[PDB]
Amino acid sequence: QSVGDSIFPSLGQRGLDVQHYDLHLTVPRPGEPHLSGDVTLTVGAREPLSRIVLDLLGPRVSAAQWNGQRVRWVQTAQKVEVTLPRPLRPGETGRLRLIYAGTPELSGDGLPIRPGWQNEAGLSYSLSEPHGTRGFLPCNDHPSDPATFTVRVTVPASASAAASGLFTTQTERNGLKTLTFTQRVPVPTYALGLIVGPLERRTAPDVQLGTQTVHRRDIYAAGLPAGTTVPEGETARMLRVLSDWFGPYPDEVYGVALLPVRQLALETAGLTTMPATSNRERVRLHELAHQWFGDQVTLADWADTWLSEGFATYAELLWAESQGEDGQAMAADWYARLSVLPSRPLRATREEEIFDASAYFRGALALHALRLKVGDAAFGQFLHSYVKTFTGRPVSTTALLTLVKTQLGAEAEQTLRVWVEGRTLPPLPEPVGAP
Ligand SMILES: N[C@@H](Cc1ccc(O)cc1)C(=O)O
Ligand code: NA
Ligand SMILES: [Zn+2]
């Protein structure tokens, strides 16, 4: 029935393939949680579905339509359940439209944050990893089912808005502004950035990555601390370093939305949600790395968060070396940090664990061990192939190990496996060197 996630066993619907969310969100008073929504989901299926079952937590649906037609629906617990006139079968699509309104609820965990629709200091914004997007959007709230997004945000004329995707039009009537954003590459629900309140959009010159053009804009909310910046030149340099390692940047634009709040940063798509207290070079790199690892390559199961966070963390070492710093010393710093902490196999079994130090640093050292085993050329080739292999296909730890085995051989697979499996922390991975 549900996606069957090992950590959050009730989220999502088995076999559902949401392909596009067309969301019109209306936020009457930014900074206060009440809101209203008009969303049309374009949905397909991997198995015959007699119902469409979406996650929703807080708001109440008041109307539903299927292909422009009246349809049976019920809202029960944390789900909206839509009974179809006939089964939705693979290869077909339909349009499910839902009208809803009310107060998004924050999930209260274990987790670093209470994810969902945040409200503070005149700002409302999504910070919804892992499973908070369902607070303000009826959705298949699981990273195994990424989708494209077109968002129209209606706000009072004194406010502005920013969502993931390129900004096109802003219209205004009766004291209300409506802004349209189009996210054209599919990302998990939690990677939908959406911020309303006092903010300004600021463009920077395009970045050229060979034949690929990446547009540049950052969001600056009002009231940022003195010195809250995106240093000139930095984002282009990080885009070059990381894309040279991972393959083409997956999106049409990149930037950060700087918020005067105190909170973790989140890799929302092409527009990282960046509270000022997290605004550091290494964090900016890390969140950009997640545009590949997490947003493009998405998780089959939340137990495997290390494939996002370990890879994003390892990107910080790749960045550090590109800036002339000693990568092995950084790996040693990761190890020293872990050597006084409990360790675990990389596949998490508890919600407490999915963003813990093992997911970030034990996962990063796993990739360090692999890299030192196969050499830098093979390792960079492997990362390119990894991103291509799990584009349009959610990744798992088993699938990674299979790819390493076939691409890099059984010895490379065993090197990664000792880091993946095993309750005790392995020794620090160190260069072979001459005999
Ligand atoms: N994904 C963030 C951490 C985070 C986790 C959950 C959140 O809701 C927000 C942020 C990172 O890259 O470290
Ligand atoms: Na999908
Ligand atoms: Zn991360």
Automatic annotation (TrEMBL):
Alphabetical keyword list: Cytoplasm, Hydrolase, Metal-binding, Metalloprotease, Protease, Zinc
One Pfam family, short name: Peptidase_M1_N
EC code: 3.4.11.2
A biological process term (GO) from this entry: proteolysis
Annotated positions binding Zn(2+) 2: 286, 290, 309
Subcellular location: Cytoplasm
Residues of the active site: 287 (proton acceptor), 360 (proton donor)
Any one GO cellular component localisation term in the record: cytoplasm
Binding-site positions, Zn(2+): 286, 290, 309
Catalytic EC class: hydrolase
Cofactor requirements of the protein: Zn(2+)
All residue ranges annotated as the Peptidase M1 membrane alanine aminopeptidase domain in the record: 271-415
Residues in Aminopeptidase N-like N-terminal domain copies: 19-190
Main location: cytoplasm
Binding site for Zn(2+) 1: 17-18, 145-146
UniProt cofactor note: Binds 1 zinc ion per subunit.
Record flagged with keyword Transit peptide: no
Reaction catalysis annotation: Release of an N-terminal amino acid, Xaa-|-Yaa- from a peptide, amide or arylamide. Xaa is preferably Ala, but may be most amino acids including Pro (slow action). When a terminal hydrophobic residue is followed by a prolyl residue, the two may be released as an intact Xaa-Pro dipeptide
Protein name as catalogued: Aminopeptidase N
The organism's taxonomic lineage, starting at the top: Bacteria, Thermotogati, Deinococcota, Deinococci, Deinococcales
